[PDB]
Amino acid sequence: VHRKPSLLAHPGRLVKSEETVILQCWSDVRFEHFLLHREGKFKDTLHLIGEHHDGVSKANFSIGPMMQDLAGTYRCYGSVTHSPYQLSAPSDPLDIVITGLYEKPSLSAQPGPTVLAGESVTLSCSSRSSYDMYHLSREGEAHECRFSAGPKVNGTFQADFPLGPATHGGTYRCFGSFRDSPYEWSNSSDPLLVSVIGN
Amino acid sequence: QVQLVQSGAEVKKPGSSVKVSCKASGGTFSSFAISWVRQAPGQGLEWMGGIIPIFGTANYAQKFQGRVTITADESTSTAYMELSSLRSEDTAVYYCARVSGTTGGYYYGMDVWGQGTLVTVSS
Amino acid sequence: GGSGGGGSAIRMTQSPSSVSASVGDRVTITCRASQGIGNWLAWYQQKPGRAPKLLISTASSLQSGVPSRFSGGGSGRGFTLTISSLQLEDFATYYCQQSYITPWTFGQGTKVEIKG
Ligand SMILES: *[C@@H]1O[C@H](CO)[C@@H](O)[C@H](O)[C@H]1NC(C)=O
Ligand SMILES: *[C@@H]1O[C@H](CO)[C@@H](O)[C@H](O)[C@H]1NC(C)=O
Predict the structure, then answer these.
(1) Which sites does the entry annotate for glycosylation (chain A)?
(2) Please, are residues A97 and A133 in contact by the beta-carbon 8 Å criterion?
(3) Which of B72, B103, B116, C62 could staple B79 via S-S, CB 3.0–4.6 A?
């Protein structure tokens, strides 16, 4: 029974195809060895000996030129021992997704892209592709997943994201995904800038 | 001097089940990621599946999922492959090999191999 | 090719299907992919009975104990394997494998034979 190693991703959990992302496990407890498990299309466990600085052990795992297999729920385990790998509690799960595999969707803003403060804005994401689910990203990273609507009268598959009352602007992007390949996402929606005018 | 010893050649009837053993020597069993490759008269080489390194779980190919289970035991230092429903076309030589790893999570190749076990599905 | 059910099995088309040549000879084997596997290709050699042996990894990296006459190159979707000086022990069947996406696929294979 050991404390959960903390796993984070630099730059972010969204990684483009043929691009590189770094995943780091840090823990106040000092493990000589760090382990990382992926659940998905390709299950693999990667080992790197821990680097001990200050009073916190850390380890930088590199996910290479991004491909489909390297996407999934990554969990980091730690061990002070060597051969038996007496293992720590699982890290909090981190889902790494690949972007750019499928066609790009479209992002709209009702009422409008530029809005006064307090006026609630509901961004919407639509595409002709039969995407089962749409995902929204603010400033390069967000966690808002909503299911797609049925084949709309216009022939579209759409999901409405209610941002709520807007006081701080931001650049939002939208991605599309299927149920069969959950951690495999589409191209990026052309960025939309919510602009707040305040008096 | 990492080398792999496979179980002896076996001959079974259609509908039966076959279990092939892959003995590991020359290193830590947990570090190795072992995969099973089938060479059939009519099929050059096919990757049936493999075991993940440390935790011993398995990835399977879609064609062979449902009839193939790949297991391992650390104490035995041996991997196993089991074909549930034998079919006449499954007659082939079955190899076990360690797939090497490299930077970025990629695996680049299968460096070590085994002598192979031949199953012959005869009525 | 692509139908929204994910990346279909990366299909390797290997060439030639068979070759007969002499000793001290040069022969080239080409391996083509459906998708782009980068440099993540491998060439294997299998002599009869004996298990297949890895010769070249990472498209161009040669494993230990491999003669320099065995040389291979390529990138993206096109790859080659060039044996500069053919020798008797070289005569066998050669395969190519993709190490990119999980559906790990091998080429059909190329057979090298001595005429004598
Ligand atoms: C991991 O990489 C990040 C980004 O460059 C860096 O800030 C951090 O110090 C690295 N950690 C280690 C242990 O090298
Ligand atoms: C994604 O966008 C890029 C440009 O950023 C384009 O080259 C590529 O073809 C797009 N992919 C799809 C599937 O539409």
Answers:
(1) 60, 154, 187
(2) no
(3) B72
Q: How far apart are CA C19 and CA C115, in angstroms?
A: 10
User: What is the extent of the structural domain holding C61?
Assistant: 22-114
Tokens of C45: 């050699």
Nearest CA distance, A65 vs chain B (angstrom): 7
Query: Do A101 and C7 count as a contact with CB atoms less than 8 A apart?
Result: yes
Let me know if residue A63 belongs to a domain: yes
B78-83 β-sheet, strand order: B3-6, B18-25, B78-83, B68-73
Instruction: Mutate one of A17, A66, A68 to test the C interface: name it (highest C CB count within 10 A).
Output: A68
Tell me how far the alpha carbon of residue B93 is from its chain's centroid: 11
- The residue of chain C nearest to residue A64, with distances taken between CA atoms, is C100
Compute the residue count for chain A.
Answer: 199
Cβ atoms of residues C15 and C109 within 8 Å? no
Q: What is the CATH number of the domain that holds B108?
A: 2.60.40.10
Task: With respect to residue A156, please indicate whether it lies within any of the assigned structural domains.
Answer: yes
How many distinct structural domains can be found in chain A? 2
Picking from A70, A99, A128, the residue at the C-terminal end of a domain is: A99
Q: For residue A127, how far is its CA from the centre of ligand 2 (angstroms)? A: 15
Count each helix (H run) and each strand (E run) in chain A, helices first. 0, 17
**Domain for residue A52, yes or no?**
yes
Integer Cα distance of C41 and A31 in angstroms? 35
Structural domain total, chain B: 1
Name the domain boundary from A99, A125, A153: A99
Q: Could you tell me if the CB of A104 is within 6 A of ligand 2?
A: yes
Residues 6+ apart with CB under 8 A from B114: B4, B5, B6, B22, B95, B96, B97, C51
Shared domain check, A190 and A121: yes
Contact B35/B50 with Cβ under 8 angstroms? yes
Q: Which helix (H) or strand (E) holds C24?
A: none
What is the rounded distance in angstroms from the CA atom of residue C85 to the CA atom of residue B14?
A: 47
Q: Which amino acid is at A91?
A: S
Q: Which two tokens stand for residue B106?
A: 């990629």
- Determination approach: X-ray
Q: Does residue A1 fall inside a structural domain?
A: no
Give the separation between CA A44 and CA A67, rounded to whole angstroms: 14
- Whether residue A77 sits in one domain with residue A44: yes
Cβ separation C100–A130 shorter than 8 A: no
State if residue A189 touches ligand 2 by the CB under 6 angstroms criterion: no
In this structure, the answer to whether residues A117 and A193 fall within a common structural domain is yes
C5 CB within 8 Å of a chain A CB: yes
Resolution in A: 3.4
Q: What is the CATH number of the domain that holds A44?
A: 2.60.40.10
Residues B28, B77 contacting (CB under 8 angstroms): no
